[PDB]
Design a protein around this ligand. Sequence first.
Ligand code: MG
Ligand code: MG
Ligand code: MG
Ligand code: MG
Ligand code: MG
Ligand code: MG
Lengths: 338, 64, 228, 108, 143, 192
Amino acid sequence: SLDIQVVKRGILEGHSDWVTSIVAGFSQKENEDSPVLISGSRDKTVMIWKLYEEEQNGYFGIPHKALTGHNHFVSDLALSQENCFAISSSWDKTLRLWDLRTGTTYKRFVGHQSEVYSVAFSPDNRQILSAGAEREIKLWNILGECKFSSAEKENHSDWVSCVRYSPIMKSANKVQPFAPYFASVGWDGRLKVWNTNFQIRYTFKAHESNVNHLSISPNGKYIATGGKDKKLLIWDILNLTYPQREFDAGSTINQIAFNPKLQWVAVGTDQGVKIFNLMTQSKAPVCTIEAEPITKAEGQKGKNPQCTSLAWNALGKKLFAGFTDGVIRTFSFETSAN
Amino acid sequence: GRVRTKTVKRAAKSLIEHYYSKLTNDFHFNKKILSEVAQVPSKRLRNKIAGFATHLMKRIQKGP
Amino acid sequence: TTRAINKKKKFVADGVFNAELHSFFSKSLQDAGYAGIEVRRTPTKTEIRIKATKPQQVIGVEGKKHKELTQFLQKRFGYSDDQIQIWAEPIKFKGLCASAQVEAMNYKLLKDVPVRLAANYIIKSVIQDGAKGCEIIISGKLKQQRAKTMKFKQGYMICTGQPKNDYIDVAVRHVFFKQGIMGVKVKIMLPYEPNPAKKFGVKTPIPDNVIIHPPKQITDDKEIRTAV
Amino acid sequence: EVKKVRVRITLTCKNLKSVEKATSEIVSRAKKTEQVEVKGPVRMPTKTLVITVRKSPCGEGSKTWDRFEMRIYKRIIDLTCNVPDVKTITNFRIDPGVEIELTMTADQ
Amino acid sequence: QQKPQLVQTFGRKKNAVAVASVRPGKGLLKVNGSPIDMINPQILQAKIYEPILLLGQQKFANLDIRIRVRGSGYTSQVYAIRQALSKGIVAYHAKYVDENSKREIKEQLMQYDRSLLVADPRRMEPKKCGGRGARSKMQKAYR
Amino acid sequence: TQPKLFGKWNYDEVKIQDPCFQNYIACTTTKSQVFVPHTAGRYQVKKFRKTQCPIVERLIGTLMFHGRNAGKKALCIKVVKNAFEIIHLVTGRNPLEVFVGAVQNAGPREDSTRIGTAGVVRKQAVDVAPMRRVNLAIYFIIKGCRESAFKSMRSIAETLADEIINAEKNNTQSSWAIRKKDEIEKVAKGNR
RNA sequence: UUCUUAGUUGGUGGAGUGAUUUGUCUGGUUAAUUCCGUUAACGAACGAGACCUUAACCUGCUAACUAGUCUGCUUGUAAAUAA
Ligand SMILES: [Mg+2]
Ligand SMILES: [Mg+2]
Ligand SMILES: [Mg+2]
Ligand SMILES: [Mg+2]
Ligand SMILES: [Mg+2]
Ligand SMILES: [Mg+2]
C-alpha cells in the first residue's frame, strides 16, 4: 500500500463564526514558500495571519490584522499577484479592495444589488470578476467601475456560487493549447465556461442539485466541480460529452482545491476533508474528520464541525481547512510507501 | 410563548414541499432561498417561516 | 414671503384648512357622490381636485354649482380669481367608494324602499365592482320606537390590524325621517392591486398572503466538445 | 454673464414618501446637469406634534387617551448654479403636502 | 491633511455618552478636561480605575487618552466613561498593534466585566396613562 | 494585582465551607472581586441571575428601603463601608469574613407552610432552599438594623455592624436575625 | 364595560320528526379555539397571530455650516511641539 498519513500542524483561531474563504501567499521567486495567510468568514471580518515557523503550544500561528469594512458575511477572497492586495466578496452587496500592509480598504465596488458569493482576480490584475444571487457576472476596473454584466441569453438560472479563472503559466514553454476562459458554477447545476469577451463558450449541465464550488488545475487542463450532488466531477476541456472523472465524496461538497503541484484534489465536505489521487483509480486516498476543540469546553459535545473552506500554500506541502467553529486547521503529509 | 402559527407552518410545509433539494441546515441560506422563491410581505414573517422550515429540514434528516 | 409661520403651526393650520374644505364640500355637495378632495398649493394658486362619482352635478348647468362654489371659497378666505382653481375628477370605480355607496342607500331609504332589499342592491353592486367583501350597518329605530341595529355582510372582511386602515374604506351618513335620525355605515374592504397601472384598491398586499412559487422546466441547449 | 449663486432648497412635508420623492429627484436632476454642484439631502430632526385627547365625549368612567401624531419632515438641499439651471431642476410634479422654499446667496 | 495616530471610541449607559480619544504618549486620563480625581461622586471613580488596574498601568503609560462625557446623570455618566475607555484601548491595539493583543485584552476585560465592551440595552420606560408611572396605576375601590 | 474590597479588604481570605452556599454566595469569582459594591447589574432578568451578584451589593440593595430612601444607593454604599470599618475595629479580621460568616450562620433551614392535601389543612414541616436561605438572612439582618436605629442616636452603620457581628456569633439575645431564625426553626420543629 | 379576556360564524358531509347538534374534542401544548394530536367530519371566514409606532445593534453605506470631529494656523495663562 501507499500510505499517505497526516501530521497535525496547528490551529488558527479568533474567527468569530464560520471560515468561508482561505487564501495562501503566491510563490514570489520560484519554488519559495509563502509567508502569507488570509481568511474570510461570516463574522464580518477578513483575517490576516502571522505564521509561527515551528508550532508553539497547539497553535500554528497568530492573528495579525483584522480587516473590518463589512456589514454582512465575507463570502470569498482573492489575492493579487503582488500578494500585497486582497479582495472581499460579501452578502452586503459590495466588494472591497484591501491593502494588505495597512488595514486600509482601497476602493470598494458598489452597484451589485442582491449579494455577492464569489470573486476572481484576472492574471493581468486589471480585471475583477464578481458574482452573486443576481444571476450575474460583473467585470470591474481596479478603479471600481462596472465594465460589463453578462446578460439573460447567456447567464444561468438561480445563483452563481463561484467564478474563477484559467491560469496562463509564465513560460510559453508550459504548453497552453486552449483559449483563455473563465468558469462559472451555479445552483441550476450548470458549469459554464466563457471567453474574455463574455461570450458563452461551453455550458454543460453538470449536476442534479446545486454547485457550491469550482477550481481549475494549475495547468488549466481540467476543472473540478462540486455541491449537494454529493459528487465530485472532473472535466477535460478537450472532451466534454462525458465527464473526465467522477468521485463519490461523502455528503455535501463545500469546497474544492487542486494541489498546485502534487496532482491531488482536496474536497471540503460537511463530514470533513477528503483527498483524491488522480494517479491511481481508487475512491478515498486520505480522509480527515475533525473533532472539536470547542467541544473541549466542559459538557458540550459536538456533532463535529463542517469545513467551510480550503487552501493550499504555494509549495503544496501545507493544507488549510476553514470550519463551522471559526477555527482554521493546518495539516501536513508524510508518505510511507510499502 | 414561542409557539408557531398556522400561516407559518403552512408556509414551511410548502417551502419544503417544492424546494427540498435546494434547502440547507443553515437558516441564513434558507431565508434567502425563501425570499427568492416567494412573496413574503414581512421580514419578520419570512424569518419565522425560514426558521421553522430549517427546523423541519433537521427533523427530516432524522426520519419520517 | 407673507408672514413667517411656525412649521408646526403652519402645518396644523394647513390640515385645518383641508378639513374645513372637506366639511364644506361634503355638506354643500350632498347630491353627487362626493368622495375626496386633494389640495395642491402654489405661491400663485390653490388647486383643489374634488374627487366625485357624479362630476356632472359638481359642475351643474354650465357652472351653476361650480361658479357658486368657486365664489364661495373666494368670499370665505378671500382670494384672487387667479388664486383659486377647482377641478372635478371622476372616480372611475363607484363600487369601490364608500361615501358614494352610503349616499346611494341614503337615497334609496328616503324613498321608503325596504331595508334588506336596498342593502342587498348596494352590496351586490359593490362586489360586482370587484371589492373583496362589504358590510353595511344601519342603526336606530327601524321597526318601532325601540332602537335596533342591523348588520349586512357579504364577501371578505377585516376589522383589526394595520391592514384595516389600508384595505377597509368606511363612510357614515345621518339619514333623516319623520321619526328621527337613523344612521348608516358602509365598510367596503377594497381589493388588492399589485400594479400602479390603475387607481384601484390597495397597492400593498395583506401581510398574510404567503405564496410559494413552484419551479419551471424550460429550453436547455448545452455546449459540448464534438467527438470525431 | 456668469452667475455663481448658492441655492438653498428647504422641503417640509407631513408625508415622508412625498418628500423623499421630491428630494431624490432634485438630487437626481441636479447631478444630471454639469453646471451643478450638490450639497446633498440634509435631514433635519423629525418633528413630532403630539396631541393626547380623552376619548369619551363624557366623563364616562374609564379614562382612555388618544395619542395623535403629526410628523413633519424637513430636508435641505444646496446647489451651486445660475438661475436657469434652478428653474430646470424644479420642473417636476410634486405630491400635494410638500412645501418648497428657495433662497439665493450670491457668490464670487 | 496628515491623518493623525488617533483612535475614537464611544460608550453608553442610559442617556449618557462618552467619546474617548486615544493617541500615543505619556499617559493622561482627562475626562471633560480634568483628571479622574475630580469626577463628581467620589465612590465610583474606582469604577473608572477598574479596567486600568485590570490591564495594568503598563498599557496606559504608553497612551494619552481624553474622554469627553455628556449625558444623563452622574452614575450613567461614570459607566459611559468606563465603556469608552475600555473599548478605546481595544481599538488602538486593533489599528496600531497586532490583532492578537486586541484579542487578549478583549478576553482579559470581558472575563472581569462585559459592561466594558458591551452597552446596557436598558433605557427608561414610557408612562402608561392612569398611573404615576410606567406600570403602577391609579388606586382602585372595589367593594 | 488582586483587588481588595474598598481597597482595604482581601477577598482571598474568604473561604466558604458549607457546600450549599459555595454556588450561592458571590465572592469566589474574578467577577465578584470588586473594589466598589456598585455593579449596575442586570441580576434580575432571569431566575437565578441574582446569585451572580456580589453579596455586598445584595446587602446594599436590601438597605435602600423605605419610601424616603428608595433609590439612594450612594448612601448605602457609605453605610456599608463604614459598618465594615467599625467591624474591623471590633473583631480585627476581614469584615467580609464576618459578613459572609454571618449570612451563612443566620437564616432559616426549616420553615412551616400550609400544604393542602385533600382534607388536610394544618401547618407542615418544610425545608428552606439555599437561595431563600441567603435572601432571608440579609432581609432579617437589615430589618433588625432599621428597627433598632430608628429613633436612636446609633447610626445605621453602627446598628448594622452590631448586627453582623452578633449574627456570626450566633447570639440569640443580641442578634435580631438569629432571634427570628430560632423562632422560625422552633415554629417548624413544633409543626412536624 | 364585560375584555385585550379568546372568543364567534357559515358551506358540504354525519346525527335528531324537531328546536338543535357535530365541526368548535379526551389529552398534551401556547400569552391565544396557539398549535399538535384525537377525530363523522372535510375544508374555510372573522377575532389571536400576521400588521403598524416608538426604544435597543451597525467604527459598513448615503450625507450634513441649521450637527460634530480632526488638520493647519493662531490667542490666553505657562520654560513651553506640556496642560
Ligand atoms: Mg411625581
Ligand atoms: Mg351546518
Ligand atoms: Mg346539515
Ligand atoms: Mg335530516
Ligand atoms: Mg361548543
Ligand atoms: Mg379546521
